[PDB]
Assembly symmetry: T
Homo-oligomer: 143 residues x 12
């Protein structure tokens, strides 16, 4: 079901919104400004992904998650409880979650195609493109 994948991805998106803010506030190192700036852009992307997933759910005639409580229940992303990081820790963690999201959007694309949902396929493949680009660049940071 396309709806089931979408709803779990919506949960992930708000959890990541929060996680990346953590990295944003609590990064240490001569690298601060770069990472602080980059994490800001990343959490804005998750805020947008969060809105988009929810509105696609609505367009499909279902209910998006509407509480942080549901988000916590439905997410596959582990919340980060540490409050201090250097650039390499942050980029490693975001990479791991991106790889998770990438597999989820591959499934989204495949599932929506089976169900003949052309619009969700287009959305999934577009997110896939953004994720695969970011994945490379993050891997490049860590090499």
């Amino acid at each position: 079901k396309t709806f089931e994948i979408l709803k779990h991805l919506q949960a992930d998106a708000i959890v990541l919104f929060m996680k990346v803010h953590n990295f944003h506030w609590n990064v240490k190192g001569t690298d601060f400004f770069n990472v602080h700036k980059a994490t800001e852009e990343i959490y804005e992307e998750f805020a947008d992904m969060f809105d988009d997933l929810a509105e696609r759910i609505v367009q499909l005639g279902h209910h998006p998650l509407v509480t942080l409580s549901e988000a916590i229940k439905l997410t596959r992303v582990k919340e980060e409880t540490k409050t201090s990081f250097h650039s390499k820790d942050i980029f490693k963690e975001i990479l791991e979650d991106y790889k998770h999201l990438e597999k989820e959007f591959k499934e989204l694309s495949n599932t929506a195609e089976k169900e003949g949902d052309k619009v969700t396929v287009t959305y999934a493949d577009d997110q896939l493109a953004k994720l695969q680009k970011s994945i490379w660049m993050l891997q490049a940071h860590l090499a």
Copy 2:
């Protein structure tokens, strides 16, 4: 303690970010576009308030909340589980939470002054100004 008020307000800000998205997605009525547009601007304001509160906490040498789990634990805002609203329901609910926030920022302003924290006073009073304006306009919607 200024830190204690800030941390609960940070929790409220992310809970409201979520609540207002609910209103944003699930508003019904000939009024749709106005409310959809207005709720978008409101949740962006809460996203900004969320970031600002957290960074003020950091500047004070403490840890902001970094998980949705903490946010749920610390918030004074009840999460909205309904998935359908007309303009009047939405404006009533936001008004109620604004009045809650307004009292919290009054306390923030007073507490930070007692502790000689001029910067947090300035921040609290500025939020107070924005809230008192919005409160009027929301009351005007419902009259």
Copy 3:
């Protein structure tokens, strides 16, 4: 006399500037933001009309009104003392005053033509165009 029509219109323009602010501040209803926004644009137009009429008077070698006292003496617009309105009340009142202004600018156009004042004719006809458009749209609100 072209000057006499201009001077009374200048008085009307500042009185309407004030009247529309009243509507702007004191509108009630789910309609608030639309009307609040629209009345803002309307009073800016009257501020501009006020300046333009006065400077045309100066160009004609006469004195514009320079006090609120003169404005009160010279206006044909009744000042609104109520402090609470819904969208329909506001649009009705503005419509009534627009119809008054429209007849005044028709006379302005005709009088200035008789006196061979081509520039005031052009100005009058341009205001006429703006007024006749707004009149339609206001009538449409009330139908």
Copy 4:
């Protein structure tokens, strides 16, 4: 045939351009400005869709329709002869035609795929995305 679907959609697009202008000019109610503004954006979208469909037809080596006469002959949209509407009438009518267009673009996407026309598939699916979003929002107006 991809060409046959495209040519009928081109006819629909110009008919809708006209229909939405009708709604644009002849809307009544306190809602006027919202609907007047929204219908303007909608007819611009149909003007763009009209141009795009015609140029895709040309790229396919065929002739687009070039007269209003052909448009009338080829359209599946009934022309609206009423000259007065409230917001709910307008949103109902546009919704009905959007649902028609949505089914047409689904067929377009499917047909072009059978014929191996990747570019028309991409175009169809993109229009599908825009339509499905608008359909939700229009349904939301009427609930």
Copy 5:
């Protein structure tokens, strides 16, 4: 009657909107980009003229044409059925229709003046200015 001239001009404007799109899509020659660009600007002008004429009709308290069917019935412009043109053919055809429009707006200006309609005179004379400029430039293309 001012209304009668306006209604036929409204019909012409939408017919020309269509005709110029034809030229836009189906121009041939090393000249392509210039003509393609220029015809785009021209059809946007006719779209604007179409809207303006219709709204002036509404302001006069009458009904504008609201269907392509009426437009076909009321137009004085012959629809172009050819699907291939070089720059000189296109500029010749547009010139011919501009000369037709120019005579219509001269009548519009004269008729509205007789009926004391200052606003329509201003509108007619402004269109006249745009047309007479374009007429020269088109004649210059063909010399």
Copy 6:
């Protein structure tokens, strides 16, 4: 009472809006363009101050003045009846009224603090900052 100071300041703001227009239209001297430009910016500031004071009054749950009649009754600013000025006359007069406003906003700040109105204090102090800067610059003109 904070309300009482605000209401008299609202009256002053519209009276000054008018007075500065007088200076704007009726300035003489090689200095014309500078003063004409500067007085334009000044009256826009008073228009803004007028709106802000009135909306703060509304936020406090009271009625702002809504007529020029009330404004005349409540103002402490004497209206200027002269219709001719040089730069030095104008700058002297504006300086005198600024000094009056400055004392009023000092009282506003002090009174609102006594009543625990943090938002009005912030507003008063901000206006105070703008006024004290302008006062210096005006004094500099006259030295």
Copy 7:
């Protein structure tokens, strides 16, 4: 004849373009920057007036002047041979030429009306509006 007035005005416009450059380069006094800036804007206006008059002549089917030689022959403006001025000299001279132009555009408006040339009337009256405004402001400089 409308053509005859236009051709002499075209000559005046290029002569004034040159004259105002003189003022622009050769102004003296603490006033330098204001006058230097203002004369720049004025000569740009004459460059535009020059182009517009010439293209209106072309639209009328006649030849505009195409040489400085013709301009010298046809102008009613005396060329300024002095190479040093203070602000008051400059504003006096421009005022004198504006008054000349103003009478010429009055004649233009009247003559074109007699000949039924609506477009030239509109152009003349628009220039008249700009000139009468500038005339006031220049008179204000010298008072």
Copy 8:
């Protein structure tokens, strides 16, 4: 293999970057500015295509070509050694290479689909859309 098609296309993109610069510098005819401008936009598109292909290769975990030497070895585009062209020569040559690229991106789309590479399919189909549009317009130049 998707990688093999991408690498040859990367080579083509830099070769075309160079070829189009040739046309850009060495175009002759009254047509100069149009072609000079158009070829500039075209080579910027190839520079972008070059970067995109290379970064997609990197995202796939392979090495893009990194030398002009490899580009020369791998390209299917013949380099243009002439140093003088008219508009028709240039548009013919670019058309021929576009048709080559179009077939390559069709294969890219098909191959990536077989290998389940959704992101490269999306990229290929998007380039296909741009190419098919440009192909039409170039054919139109030559007709």
Copy 9:
């Protein structure tokens, strides 16, 4: 003498300003819009060159020419009396005058260097760069 070359170039610049307007107004052919647009940019460049030369003369402590009469006396450019041109005629004529200007700026550069005038050398060489580029492009039009 640097002054002598500058003064004759100032005369040329205003003569060319006029000549290029001629081409601008009186160009014929399917080429109209390109040439009309290009000649507009060219005469703006001569207006700028005219101002710059004159102000450099002033900076050198001498008097620039201040009348069209002096310009006619001092110019080396023959005024164009024809009132009809095709693109090739226009580009030929501008080319011829550019070649004249180019030799003049070479002399300017050389003369100012002999006299140790570094600023005029820089100005001359910069104009030389612009001219040599334009000369190529014009030659390209005619090949």
Copy 10:
């Protein structure tokens, strides 16, 4: 005395303007561009702080420092004579001076309050907010 604190802060601001330029020019390391960019923004802030402090002094009716000589005499900041730094050295030094400034603005805020100077309190607290934010971020660089 508020004046005494302001005057020493004015001295500090110009000394820091100079010190940060040193860091700006003479930073070494792979970090160069980040630090070079960041130090540019920092010295612009000190230039602004310098101007603001001086103009506040003027508004208070006193004389600001007007020479580098006074600045040297009055500053509490030690001038940096080294001409080579890595990012960590630079951020350490700026941090130390920020902490000094922060204590000075705390005193400024407190002193101005005692003297009833509301405007200087507002200015001090605003600078305090900017400083406390920058202090955190600099500390984060060094952790």
Copy 11:
């Protein structure tokens, strides 16, 4: 030596930055706004000149001055201790220092040429151009 001239000019640039701020803050007269605005632009130019000279020194492999102490030691500009000026005093003083700078940049240009330093010649000549223009305009203020 090019370095020696550059280092003294760097000292002058920061001294002038300070001197012009003095004029900026402490100008008196109806002229205030013009001079206040103009001196702001002038000190920004000296801030830029200061940065540029220092970075050119660095590019030459030497150390720029890095303290106000060195600046005071190395400058040829006398610091202004007065705290009150009218427009004419200010423009006289800036003129005198500009003439000093102009001679310094002439030497810079000549010296760098002898040493074969083409880049410093270009920089010197460019500053020379800006200075010679400003010198004229300042002389014009005082005539």
Copy 12:
């Protein structure tokens, strides 16, 4: 010969365009975004230098290189075959090639001067200025 230096520099510019793309795609390290961004700006500069050199060659009446084959034959830059770099490797390599280019533009400047080619001297010296600045900043990265 100026032409010979230009043609080899044109070859270098396209080779460097390619080399810097290599660095752009294949940079590794926490530094990724900075270097990726900086190398993008650098290759755009080489693309611009490539175009400029070629068009200067054309202006001189000769043929620029028009194939990658010629570029390979004529370049003095060794192509980089590695596909992995850290920031320090990249900045070292670009520095080395900049130093090569710098010596080439010194020769260009000297040679063009001998041949009396003022325009190429200006171009060479301008590139020299950009290169000497970049050389410093790159050296600073590596210190």
